[PDB]
């Protein structure tokens, strides 16, 4: 079922080994007026790199992006189309800085084309410094 | 090339040294430098041998047994004066100082005495009573500083309880509206 990794998988805050006679879970609000999702509380998973149920806090900047790849485990790759004006030739240039953000399995139905706001945090790997905060649905296509 | 301690060689080796070890003076603080030293063993490839006579012989050499070199510097710490002169804690050390006669041509015969270190002095007793006074003064200062804060803490905990007593009075008015 769960805890298929090498060591024991649990939240560092919780403790269930006290003398008995559902498992307790610890979470946190994120700030800047973003809600806490329902399944991060309801679920039984753990993730130390999640800004809701892990030892990481969002600080600095908060930006957005659109998902283009998901072929990794527990993280995705986003696309960031931004426009830059050139002073000499008075026209715009199409540039993007695609980079990976850590998608926790707190969200389940994540598809292509979804706009996802993202928050700066401490570096958790070589190049990722971001985590998925909340996921908005795509333009239509409910089915 | 001077010889070394414990190198256990016989020829000529270059060895790095450090502070706290002999045969190398640290010019910069903690600098490492190799130095050509000789082995700890003695052989015929030597120029000067340094010998220390521990057991005196039966016959009399006129070089060291005849002429006894007087002491250059006596003890300076008052405890070594107590060790040398067999002094207790109560007897005075100032009268038992080791002075030296000083005389030369053109000047009067003088005498000089060392400045005794770690001697019982009412100056350091003034320092000893001062550092325990600051222990007294800081104990008294923070005790009253906490006492005035406790009354200041007792100053809010009555208005804050009354502030909630006025607020719990306020919820009763809205319940009867």
């Amino acid at each position: 079922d769960i805890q298929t990794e090498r060591a024991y998988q649990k939240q560092p805050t919780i403790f269930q080994n006290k003398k008995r006679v559902k498992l307790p879970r610890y979470y946190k609000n994120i700030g800047l007026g973003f809600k806490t999702p329902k399944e991060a509380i309801e679920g039984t998973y753990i993730d130390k790199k999640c800004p809701f149920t892990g030892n990481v806090s969002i600080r600095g900047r908060i930006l957005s992006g659109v998902v283009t790849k998901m072929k990794m485990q527990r993280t995705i790759v986003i696309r960031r189309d931004y426009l830059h004006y050139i002073r000499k030739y008075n026209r715009f240039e199409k540039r993007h800085k695609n980079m990976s953000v850590h998608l926790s399995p707190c969200f389940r139905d994540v598809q292509i084309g979804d706009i996802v706001t993202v928050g700066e945090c401490r570096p958790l790997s070589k190049t990722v410094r971001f985590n998925v905060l909340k996921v908005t649905k795509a333009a239509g296509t409910k089915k | 090339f001077p010889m070394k301690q414990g190198v256990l060689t016989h020829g000529r080796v270059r060895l790095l040294l450090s502070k706290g070890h002999s045969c190398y003076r640290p010019r910069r603080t903690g600098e490492r430098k190799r130095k050509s030293v000789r082995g700890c063993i003695v052989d015929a490839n030597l120029s000067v041998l340094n010998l220390v006579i521990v057991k005196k012989g039966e016959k009399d050499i006129p070089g060291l047994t005849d002429t006894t070199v007087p002491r250059r510097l006596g003890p300076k710490r008052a405890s070594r004066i107590r060790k040398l002169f067999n002094l207790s804690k109560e007897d005075d050390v100032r009268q038992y100082v080791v002075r030296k006669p000083l005389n030369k041509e053109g000047k009067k015969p003088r005498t000089k005495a060392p400045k005794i270190q770690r001697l019982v002095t009412p100056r350091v007793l003034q320092h000893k009573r001062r550092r325990i006074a600051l222990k007294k003064q800081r104990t008294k200062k923070n005790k009253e500083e906490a006492a005035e804060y406790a009354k200041l803490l007792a100053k809010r905990m009555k208005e804050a309880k009354e502030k909630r007593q006025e607020q719990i009075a306020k919820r009763r008015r809205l319940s009867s509206l």
């Binding site: 024991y8 649990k10 403790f15 269930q16 080994n17 006290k18 006679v21 | -």
Partner: protein, 206 residues
């Protein structure tokens, strides 16, 4: 030795960076501890900022927390059973963080028949002839019999723990880092956490 620098390797694409400076003193990496079990021996190292760290080479001290009653003793360490990091450290006796090891139970046993005075384990046929701990179980007054009766009803032990105490050996986890501070503290395995690793030892042994 080893250098702790991000710029010595490739980009996210695959290109190789061109460094602009030599390895610095704040890019320092020293050889690993790789401690063993024996007499106590701490080696000190000077670190960045004028502080100190304590490197363990052979260590026997360890203060391990019993979770259900929150009491810990500095109990001897004897061996290594399983480590979640490397299978070589399973066989080579080393203690790093998060090591599942076998420890003696007796310092926690002494507290149990002293504060609570209830027999746990203690297979019949053998009795303590020095009679030191029967004093710890007998000679009760009137109003302390009420207190020890209260402890009797509030000491329902788990069935998994008693089997582990029957052999005298307990399982412990290394929460602290002996490489940094020289201490190999942790907490004793209990309940579901202990139950997971008894399946894991058989999964590797066969």
């Amino acid at each position: 030795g080893i250098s702790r620098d991000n710029w010595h390797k490739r980009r996210k694409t695959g290109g190789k960076r061109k460094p602009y400076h030599k390895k610095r003193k704040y890019e320092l990496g020293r050889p690993a501890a790789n401690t063993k079990i024996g007499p106590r021996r701490i080696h000190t190292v000077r670190v960045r900022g004028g502080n100190k760290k304590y490197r363990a080479l052979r260590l026997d001290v360890g203060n391990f927390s019993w979770g259900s009653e929150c009491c810990t003793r500095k109990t001897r360490i004897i061996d290594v059973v399983y480590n979640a990091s490397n299978n070589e450290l399973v066989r080579t006796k080393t203690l790093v963080k998060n090591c599942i090891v076998l420890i003696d139970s007796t310092p926690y046993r002494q507290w149990y028949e002293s504060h609570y005075a209830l027999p746990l384990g203690r297979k019949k046929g053998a009795k303590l002839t020095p009679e030191e701990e029967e004093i710890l179980n007998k000679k009760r007054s009137k109003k302390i019999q009420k207190k020890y009766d209260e402890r009797k009803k509030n000491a329902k032990i788990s069935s998994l723990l008693e089997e582990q105490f029957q052999q005298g050996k307990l399982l412990a986890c290394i929460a602290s880092r002996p490489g940094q501070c020289g201490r190999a503290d942790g907490y004793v395995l209990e309940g579901k956490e202990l139950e997971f690793y008894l399946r894991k030892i058989k999964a590797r042994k066969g």
